[PDB]
A paper describes a structure:
The α-oxoamine synthases (AOSs) are pyridoxal 5’-phosphate (PLP)-dependent enzymes that catalyse the irreversible, decarboxylative, Claisen-like condensation of an amino acid with an acyl-CoA thioester, to generate α-aminoketones. The thermophilic PLP-dependent biocatalyst ThAOS catalyses an irreversible, Claisen-like, C-C bond-forming reaction that yields useful aminoketone building blocks. In this work, we show for the first time that an AOS biocatalyst (ThAOS) can be rationally engineered to use an expanded range of natural and unnatural amino acid substrates.
Furthermore, we determined the crystal structure of the ThAOS V79A variant in complex with a PLP:l-penicillamine (L-Pen) external aldimine with a view to understand the impact of engineering at V79. This data is consistent with the formation of a covalent ThAOS PLP:l-Pen ring-closed thiazolidine adduct and this was refined to an excellent fit and geometry. The two chains of the ThAOS V79A variant align with around 0.4 Å RMSD Cα to the wild type ThAOS structure over the 397 residues. There is no significant structural change in the active site in the V79A variant with PLP: l-Pen bound when compared to the wild type PLP-bound ThAOS, with no shift in the loop around the altered residue. The crystal structure of the ThAOS V79A variant with a PLP: l-Pen inhibitor bound displayed little change compared to the wild-type enzyme so this suggest that the enhanced properties must be due to subtle and dynamic changes to the structure and electronics of the PLP-bound transition states.
Author numbering:
A (entry chain A): -1 to 396
B (entry chain B): 2 to 396
Write the structure that this text describes.
């Protein structure tokens, strides 16, 4: 109009004002001690139920020592993309260790779980393919699909009846790909692969699982959701997951046939066009895989802690939304009440972050608690005491 | 019937092999340095982006070690939830100070920074004006937006003006360019683009992956070089993985930009923050370049030397202006053969042909660094002379 196209500060102001009006403006907390089940926020020690540190690895000396070894040997940076002089021996060492752990012929690491989805989906899919995506799939899956030319269908969450209706109605001569989170990040439920994968065979579809929140959590020694349901050697199951949660570093990976690995090396755009991970990162992750083999009882402790916390929340009167994994949402309903409960929990010494629309539905705002192997009973009971006090105060529990 | 996974993979791998585009990367067997080891042999490495010699520098490694020991192996969360720690803020403050901008935000890569910042800025009804030769990660970031996308001929400010005149909007006009073009090593003409932006009420976005640590006073970057680092209508994105010899990307500009990105950039909202060893190395890098500003000088000395010697042999370096030093071979097969023959001489550089670069403009890309010595550069020049004579590109 009269004054011309917007300047940057005007565009920013208009978007920030809009977000503040919609109750979406965020001011994240700064942690002042390491990533542990007790940490420091705003000058205070707090029970931390906000992180993805499922196994207690993020500040574990074993990982730190292997990191240090690789840092000293190889340096601070790789200096290139994997394709052109950024692959070093340590990259391949980690890929081989991951494949062995996962039980697949091969494994390929990408720069994040977020980019792994983009890269793997983009390498696999082509115009005229059909994708069947779970309604509640992660945002990184959505962005990966949007960069492809595949036809995209959405099935109601975990609804295998709906999925079969779409598989009957929508055919192709190319690839049919059923795409799901393995463990859904917000509600903590598990994709029903026991039903999806047989369905896939009946309609000659491939299944793709983003197991970010199942790696190090489900299956024998944390080998993941796909391993848990017994499908880890099926070549028509594509396994993606992340190295940033249980494994407590950064990165994403795919695991399968030497030839799938070769496709990703040739085609995945975040692999072709982004720098490889540095030695300290890779050494920590090699450490993580060694430590879970040494201390597999961490996974048992994780699940013991989980069942305890969930049972005690239910006894107070809270709703954990049918969650099945250490992801333990507590329903508050409206986003303002979730955010107020998070504030009041912090006053009590408990750090857990409120989440509302658009991340989760209107009227299904929650606080996401993630239980870890490193939480103690007294930490969990402190968190439960805080939830009792706050919930009574807000009138959601008796 | 449908395709199964192995069939789709085989179809696509066979396709790439029939097109001669299937790649088999090499595995480096020693640290990222100007001399390294490939396939069991020592080589002069002209295939890194390690402009300042920081990748294996003990100063970065010691600061990395300190932060690893203090804070651990992982952040364990996205920045928005429980993944912002004191050391992230320390790095952002240090980066803003070095850049000369009001603010700085670190993101998981230069690749994802482009997606995050373009996504946060752009809305339906905005008009983008992109340089023909912009990086692939800019393309992917634009594809995720609902903005109208126009392409101007490479560095053609006449063309850009014609488009800016013809395509007005009540929303945002964003002129998007690499700062330093990854393949040819030329520099965006921001001294003409930015005035043109003012005339047509546009914002300028610069992906300065290959300018950060390279151009400008003390390596402050391309936007600093052209004098526009305090302009709120210039947005900079770059990588921390080349000169700064880590991983990560950053966005630098007006204070309000940072606030928008925190709230809106999808790779920021939906991915884990970087770990202490990575942040510590980068804090180290910013301290080291303030202590040893002569590294930037050496980088440019080395570049001028290499370029002049290649010209003296009879090679064409394509008008490159930065340490990115392409040598023209013409067709892709000859560039690949030259790269193979250079490796046999102990010189490691990257052959590039169509589709990445135009037909007839296939090249070997060499990146000179501050850490290359005269004897290394002369070894490279010796190999180029031998190979060039053998292939008849030079006399
Ligand atoms: C202009 C530009 N922007 C972003 C990146 C990615 O930064 P990162 O994600 O690694 O932080 C690159 C990379 N440069 C590589 C190279 O020049 O060798 C490439 C293999 C072409 S991709 C780039 O040139
Ligand atoms: C299913 C799924 N896939 C990929 C990623 C991205 O992995 P990264 O890029 O960090 O390696 C996530 C992240 N989970 C975060 C969290 O649940 O806390 C998120 C903040 C919702 S994004 C995820 O849930």
């Amino acid at each position: 109009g009269a004054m011309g196209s917007l300047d940057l500060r005007a565009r920013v102001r208009e978007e920030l004002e809009r977000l503040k009006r919609e109750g979406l403006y965020i001011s994240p907390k700064v942690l002042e001690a390491p990533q542990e089940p007790v940490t420091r926020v705003e000058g205070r020690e707090v029970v931390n139920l906000a992180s993805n540190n499922y196994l207690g690895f993020a500040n574990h000396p074993y990982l730190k020592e292997k990191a240090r070894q690789y840092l000293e040997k190889w340096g601070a940076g790789s200096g290139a993309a994997r394709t052109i002089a950024g692959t070093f021996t340590y990259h391949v060492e980690l890929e081989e260790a991951l494949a062995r752990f996962k039980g697949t012929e091969s494994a390929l690491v990408l720069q994040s779980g977020f980019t792994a989805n983009q890269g793997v989906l983009g390498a696999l899919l082509k115009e005229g393919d059909v994708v069947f995506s779970d309604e509640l799939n992660h945002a990184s899956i959505i962005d990966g699909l949007r960069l492809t030319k595949a036809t995209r269908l959405v099935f109601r969450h975990a609804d295998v009846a709906h999925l079969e209706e779409l598989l009957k109605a929508h055919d192709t001569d190319g690839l049919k790909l059923i795409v799901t989170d393995g463990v859904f990040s917000m509600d903590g439920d598990i994709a029903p692969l026991d039903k999806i994968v047989p369905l896939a065979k009946k309609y000659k579809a491939v299944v793709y699982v983003d197991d970010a929140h199942g790696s190090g959590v489900l299956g024998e020694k944390g080998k993941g959701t796909v391993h848990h349901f017994g499908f880890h050697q099926d070549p028509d199951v594509v396994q993606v997951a992340t190295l940033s949660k249980a494994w407590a570093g950064i990165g994403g990976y795919a695991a399968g046939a030497r030839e799938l690995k070769d496709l990703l090396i040739n085609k995945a755009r975040p692999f072709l066009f982004s720098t490889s991970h540095p030695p300290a990162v890779v050494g920590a992750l090699l450490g993580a895989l060694e430590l879970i083999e040494k201390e597999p009882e961490r996974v048992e402790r994780l699940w013991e802690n989980t069942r305890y916390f969930k049972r005690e929340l239910a006894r107070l009167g809270y709703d954990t939304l049918g969650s099945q994994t250490p992801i333990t949402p507590v329903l508050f309903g409206e986003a303002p009440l979730a955010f107020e409960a998070s504030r009041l929990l912090l006053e009590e010494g408990v750090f857990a972050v409120g989440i509302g629309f658009p991340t989760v539905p209107r009227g299904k705002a929650r606080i996401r608690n993630i239980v870890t192997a490193a939480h103690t009973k007294e930490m969990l009971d402190k968190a439960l005491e805080a939830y009792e006090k706050v919930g009574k105060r807000l009138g959601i529990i008796r």
